[PDB]
From a paper:
In order to understand the molecular details of how m5CMP binds CST with a higher affinity than CMP, we determined the X-ray crystal structure of CST in complex with m5CMP. Crystals of CST were grown using the lipidic cubic phase method, in the presence of 400 μM m5CMP. However, one key difference is that the CST-m5CMP crystals diffracted X-rays to a much higher resolution of 1.8 Å (compared to 2.6 Å for the CST-CMP crystals). This let us build a highly-detailed model which contained 13 lipid molecules and 162 waters resulting in a Rwork and Rfree of 18.5% and 19.8%, respectively. Overall, the CST-m5CMP structure is very similar to the CST-CMP structure, with a r.m.s.d. of 0.17 Å. m5CMP binds in an essentially identical orientation as CMP does and there are no obviously-significant differences in the conformation of the residues that line the substrate-binding cavity. The eponymous methyl group of m5CMP occupies a small and mostly-hydrophobic pocket. This pocket is present but vacant in the CMP-bound structure which explains how CST can accommodate the addition of a methyl group at the C-5 position on the pyrimidine ring. By comparing the two structures, it seems that the burial of m5CMP’s C-5 methyl in this hydrophobic pocket is the primary contributor to the 16-fold increase in m5CMP’s binding affinity compared to CMP, on account of the hydrophobic effect. The residues that line the methyl-interacting hydrophobic pocket–primarily Phe195, Thr260 (Cγ2 atom), and Val264, but also Tyr98, Gly192, Met213, and Ser261 (only Cα and Cβ atoms) are highly conserved among orthologous CST proteins (SLC35A1 gene products) from other organisms, suggesting that the ability for CST to bind m5CMP is a conserved property across species. However, including increasing amounts of m5CMP during the 41°C incubation leads to more and more protein being protected from denaturation, to the point where saturating amounts of m5CMP are able to prevent any denaturation–as indicated by the peak height for the 100 μM sample being identical to the sample that was kept at 4°C. By plotting peak heights against ligand concentration, we can determine an apparent Kd of 1.0 ± 0.1 μM.
Numbering used by the authors: 9 to 317, 321 to 330
The structure:
């Protein structure tokens, strides 16, 4: 149990960090530029395949595996229909991430996208029948400022050789921020509404996710893809991004299961701070004054959020 939590967070933290800069890299240095829509779609395919394997391991046998697929996919059309909503919303979110990093510096993206933290807290209280004390709300905005400081970097020195539309990038992030809170909390509500396996829920969602993301690939880029090919512009780094997005999505679902969507934001900030401090001590990595102050705010916000809060009996007695 202890090791699984350590492996989930160090995987989450290395993947999320590497993901943004690697994605930015692939969008700015290529001559032949791949279709972002296709990478989002292939990510859904990989997550489905890994989730299927994890369900086989969890069920423990081919017969129990087949039985679970039959009851929970073939036999649960309403669950498939419900989870099509976050699949639609996530298809937009993940495509907006590529659009934004095509047009903005990674650090500009990272700071702005942290607005998902208060968004996700609001979605949580509105959709999950939960409350936050006034002190907890303070801690949520404190966390947001802390991670903003943690992520604040000087702009990259490399000159960009492709056209950029930063305003389009900011519009993309604004959409992604709204998507992040709504789809994550929607998935959480479905997951915690029954004892159905996490891996069943992921399979249920990725099935519609593959359909929606491929349809979006067709509608956005179908004509140019018939000309250039679906995998036009793919490189080792494009696959690296897809792999990172796949692992990151799977571990996101795990963190939501064992904690919640608000704790996800606190735990990711703690992991970024601790892994950065580890790299200072192990490798002499240099940090900024912004990071140092943000780290303290992250620490205080975690402390404040966990402090002990009658006015929420419906919350604690039934979920
Ligand atoms: C694999 C992805 C899941 C797609 C649905 C698989 C359905 C199968 O189930 C057959 C069993 C009958 O006993
Ligand atoms: C951005 C915030 C989006 C808030 C949505 C709140 C919501 O969807 O509440 C639904 C309610 O639980 C029943 O329909
Ligand atoms: C609060 C919400 C405020 C943001 C609302 C709209 C942003 C508009 C810009 C977002 C653009 C993403 C969708 C889009 O139009 O994609 C263009 C693409 O280049 C061709 O398909
Ligand atoms: C914050 C919301 C910012 C919304 C910006 C919308 C935008 O700038 O869109 C550019 C347009 O797509 C040009 O091609
Ligand atoms: C393998 C095939 C299923 C894969 C994706 C389905 C995508 C989600 C679409 C599911 C729609 C089911 C539906 O609309 O029927 C619901 C009705 O309430 C009946 O219970
Ligand atoms: C169906 C919805 C799936 C979401 C597909 C969004 C496609 C998109 O917005 O892509 C713009 C393009 O990448 C600009 O270069
Ligand atoms: C925790 C308080 C410890 C304060 C240590 C801060 C170190 C620091 O901010 O280093 C910046 C860098 O050396 C140059 O920008
Ligand atoms: C909840 C959930 C999210 N995801 C993915 O995890 C990511 C969540 O990103 P954010 O924490 O920035 O919203 C998205 O890329 C989404 O597609 C997933 O793959 N499976 C899930 N069950």
């Amino acid at each position: 149990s202890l090791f699984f939590k350590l492996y989930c967070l160090t995987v989450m933290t290395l993947v999320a960090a590497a993901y943004t800069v690697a994605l930015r890299y692939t969008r700015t240095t290529a001559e032949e530029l791949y279709f972002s829509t296709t990478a989002v779609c292939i990510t859904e395919v990989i997550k489905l395949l890994i989730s299927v394997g994890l369900l086989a391991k969890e069920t423990g046998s081919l017969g129990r595996f087949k039985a679970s697929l039959s009851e929970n996919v073939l036999g649960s059309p309403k669950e498939l229909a419900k989870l099509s909503v976050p699949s639609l919303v996530y298809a937009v979110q993940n495509n907006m991430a590529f659009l934004a990093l095509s047009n903005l510096d990674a650090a500009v993206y990272q700071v702005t996208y942290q607005l998902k933290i208060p968004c996700t807290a609001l979605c949580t209280v509105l959709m999950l029948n939960r409350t936050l004390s006034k002190l907890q709300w303070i801690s949520v905005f404190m966390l947001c400022g802390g991670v903003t400081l943690v992520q604040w970097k000087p702009a990259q020195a490399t000159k960009v050789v492709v056209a950029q539309n930063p305003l389009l990038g900011f519009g993309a992030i604004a959409i992604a921020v709204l998507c992040s809170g709504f789809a994550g909390v929607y998935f959480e509500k479905v997951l915690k509404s029954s004892d159905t396996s996490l891996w069943v829920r992921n399979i249920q969602m990725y099935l519609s996710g593959i359909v929606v993301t491929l349809a979006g690939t067709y509608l956005s880029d179908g004509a140019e893809i018939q000309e250039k090919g679906f995998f036009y512009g793919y490189t080792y780094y494009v696959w690296f991004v897809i792999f990172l997005a796949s692992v990151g999505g799977l571990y996101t679902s795990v963190v939501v299961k064992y904690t919640d969507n608000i704790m996800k934001g606190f735990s990711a900030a703690a992991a970024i701070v601790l892994s950065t401090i580890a790299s200072v001590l192990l490798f002499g990595l240099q940090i900024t004054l912004s990071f140092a102050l943000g780290a303290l705010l992250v620490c205080v916000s975690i402390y404040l959020y966990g402090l002990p809060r009658t006015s929420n009996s419906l919350e604690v007695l039934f979920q």
